[PDB]
Structure 1
Amino acid sequence: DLKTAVFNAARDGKLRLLTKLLASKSKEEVSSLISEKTNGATPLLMAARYGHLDMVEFLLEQCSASIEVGGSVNFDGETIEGAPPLWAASAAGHLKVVQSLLNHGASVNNTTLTNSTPLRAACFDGHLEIVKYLVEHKADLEVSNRHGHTCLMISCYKGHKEIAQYLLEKGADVNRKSVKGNTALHDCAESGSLDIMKMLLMYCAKMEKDGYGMTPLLSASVTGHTNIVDFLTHHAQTSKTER
């Protein structure tokens, strides 16, 4: 029951209570209690996921053994397995927690079980400051998830212009193809992100067919993004005005 009481105090950031529950315990005892999993998650992972900074700081100062341990977290109603504290904090948008974990020696490229990096985690809900902090702390831009979907691809798919712009400047590969032949240009077409598509084209992104035989023009047509259909048809027909 003490392990459960410790986990419950850590998950809800009740630092006063946790201090009292660990009051006269040894290093071995505290480390064991703080590194155990409850319902597939460690106290640190939960403190990090819900952004309890003081709680994160306390647990890391007691023991850092669980800093790389991936566990069960929930986002958009779905369970994500093997997510380490840095990924969860990055995905949930807790910048000070991201900074605390990195200051305590967290691995910037340590992924979930599906090979999603903390940088990819921050790009999904568009946490620009976290993206910059991670890139500044040697996050690899080319580590894609198991689908071969990159940080640049997901930023375009979600229409995060500022993040896509930053990734491009930092040297993100515009012509990377996912497992199914998807490129960042297709992500733009599907989200109707005309300004990001223009950026990619400025960084020499090429129009390509994906595994489904779809080019970005066709992806825009089937998703009803007429802004991108108009732009690409005009781009294709402009040289026909030449006598």
Structure 2
Amino acid sequence: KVETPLHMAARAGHTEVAKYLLQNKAKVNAKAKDDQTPLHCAARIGHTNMVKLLLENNANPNLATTAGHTPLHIAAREGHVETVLALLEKEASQACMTKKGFTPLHVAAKYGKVRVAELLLERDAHPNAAGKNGLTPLHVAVHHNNLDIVKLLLPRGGSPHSPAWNGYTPLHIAAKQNQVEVARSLLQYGGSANAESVQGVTPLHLAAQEGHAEMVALLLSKQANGNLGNKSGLTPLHLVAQEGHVPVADVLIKHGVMVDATTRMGYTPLHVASHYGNIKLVKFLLQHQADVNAKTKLGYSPLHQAAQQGHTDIVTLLLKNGASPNEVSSDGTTPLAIAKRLGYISVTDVLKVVTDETHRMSFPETVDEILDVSE
């Protein structure tokens, strides 16, 4: 791999052979395949003394590979504290960033190296450095679930309020991934539970969507707004209806969240729960006074959504709870007409009993937000 003898000495760690090679004839900053210097190979294995020798002779720490990894990045990846100290003593730049946008502090946060992160933050590291994606070391520490790295970054200036490209905070990632302790630390250091993404998504929205009842209770204890909606008007109860978590809906309803909150197009949580086929949450909402005959702006009932999506048991439960057939939407379709249109035999059979004698599909708004911070 375009390997010089100095590279081979660097990988193994014989400092005397490399000393003699550098004495007679060897380029210290010689590059190999994947643009690797002998400093990179010495920092990967963590041989401190050989690193000091190479750096003392002519090695430049700022040289980076095709992936953008300086020897500081590799030493932070493998948690070599003495190698990091020697490199920083020989003017290694922590401002150097990989192609992904990672500083050595970012790599330490990713791989949980708390001693390397301690040393870097001790000597001239910005806790809130970010790349094009806007990810901070706190973002990576929360994403990879490094509690020690978070608890070390927060006192020294790791900001919970730092937004990513999509507007996500570290508290967003903590709430989505059910990292309760990380969430408590972030909220202790000023994290806001009502911080919004580019689409209006709050950490409460992500916690309710992912079915983390303890996380939802923790956020609600910190001035989270359960009635707050995203750009499409979807509430955390709407996301609970989309995925179907009864315990989260219990906490939300006990907090005081409006059961019949409407989106931009008039969809209620009962509408979404009937659409997505979560019968238990339909029962829960109907027990908590949801409007069974609620209509959207286009006149669609939850029974309309149930017939359109073919949920026969949802249809039966709605009719048992007072859903009214023969009601006509603005498109001119009854639930029996929709069931006949997409040919759901069971839904048609159930609806034909309670319906008297006489090409648009209704879809609730959804959240397409997702964060790409892995790898």
* TM-score bucket (shorter structure): 0.7 to 0.9
In the alignment, the residues of structure 2 paired with residue 139 and residue 15 of structure 1 have an alpha-carbon distance, to the nearest angstrom, of 32
Write the letter of the residue equivalent to 2:168.
Answer: A
1:230 is matched with: 349
Give 1:54 deviation, angstroms. Answer: 1.0
Write the letter of the residue equivalent to 1:2.
Answer: P
Matched, 1:58 2:185: yes
Normalising to structure 2: TM-score of the pair?
0.56
Structure number having the greater helix percentage: 1
Contact map agreement 2:310 2:344 (CA 8 A) in 1: yes
Matched, 1:21 2:153: yes
Greater radius of gyration (CA): 2
Contact map agreement 1:181 1:210 (CA 8 A) in 2: yes
Give the unaligned 5+ runs of structure 2: 1-125, 129-135, 358-375
Q: Pairwise mapping of residues 130-169 of structure 1 onto structure 2 (< 5 A)? A: 130-169=248-287
Q: Pairwise mapping of residues 171-186 of structure 1 onto structure 2 (< 5 A)? A: 171-186=289-304
Q: What's the % identity of the aligned pairs? A: 28
In the alignment, the residues of structure 1 paired with residue 301 and residue 278 of structure 2 have an alpha-carbon distance, to the nearest angstrom, of 16
Give 1:226 deviation, angstroms. Answer: 0.8
In the alignment, the residues of structure 1 paired with residue 215 and residue 292 of structure 2 have an alpha-carbon distance, to the nearest angstrom, of 30
2:141 is matched with: 9
Q: Pairwise mapping of residues 102-113 of structure 1 onto structure 2 (< 5 A)? A: 102-113=220-231
2:173 is matched with: 46
Give 1:59 deviation, angstroms. Answer: 0.3
1:194 is matched with: 312
In the alignment, the residues of structure 1 paired with residue 332 and residue 247 of structure 2 have an alpha-carbon distance, to the nearest angstrom, of 37
Evaluate the alpha carbon distance shift between residue 38 and residue 237 of structure 1 in structure 2; reply closer, same or farther with a 3 A threshold: closer
Cα-to-partner distance string for 1:15-43 (whole Å, 9 max, x where unaligned):
111222345x3xxx45xx21121222111
1:75 is matched with: none
Question: What SS does the aligned partner of 2:200 have?
Answer: strand
Give 1:129 deviation, angstroms. Answer: 1.0
Structure number having the greater strand percentage: 1
Question: What SS does the aligned partner of 1:196 have?
Answer: helix
Contact map agreement 2:204 2:226 (CA 8 A) in 1: yes
Contact map agreement 1:51 1:89 (CA 8 A) in 2: yes
Contact map agreement 1:190 1:219 (CA 8 A) in 2: yes
Evaluate the alpha carbon distance shift between residue 214 and residue 83 of structure 1 in structure 2; reply closer, same or farther with a 3 A threshold: same
2:197 is matched with: 71
Contact map agreement 2:336 2:355 (CA 8 A) in 1: no
2:333 is matched with: 214
Residue from 85, 95, 99 that aligns with 2:213: 95
Residue from 202, 214, 222 that aligns with 1:84: 202
In the alignment, the residues of structure 1 paired with residue 197 and residue 147 of structure 2 have an alpha-carbon distance, to the nearest angstrom, of 21
In the alignment, the residues of structure 2 paired with residue 170 and residue 21 of structure 1 have an alpha-carbon distance, to the nearest angstrom, of 43
Q: Which has the higher contact order (CA 8 A, sep 6+)?
A: 1
- CA root-mean-square deviation: 1.8
Give the aligned length: 223
Normalising to structure 1: TM-score of the pair?
0.85
Q: Pairwise mapping of residues 106-125 of structure 1 onto structure 2 (< 5 A)? A: 106-125=224-243
Cα-to-partner distance string for 1:21-73 (whole Å, 9 max, x where unaligned):
345x3xxx45xx21121222111112112221111111011114x2211115x
Question: What SS does the aligned partner of 2:206 have?
Answer: helix
Give 1:236 deviation, angstroms. Answer: 4.2
Contact map agreement 1:12 1:47 (CA 8 A) in 2: no
In the alignment, the residues of structure 1 paired with residue 267 and residue 288 of structure 2 have an alpha-carbon distance, to the nearest angstrom, of 18
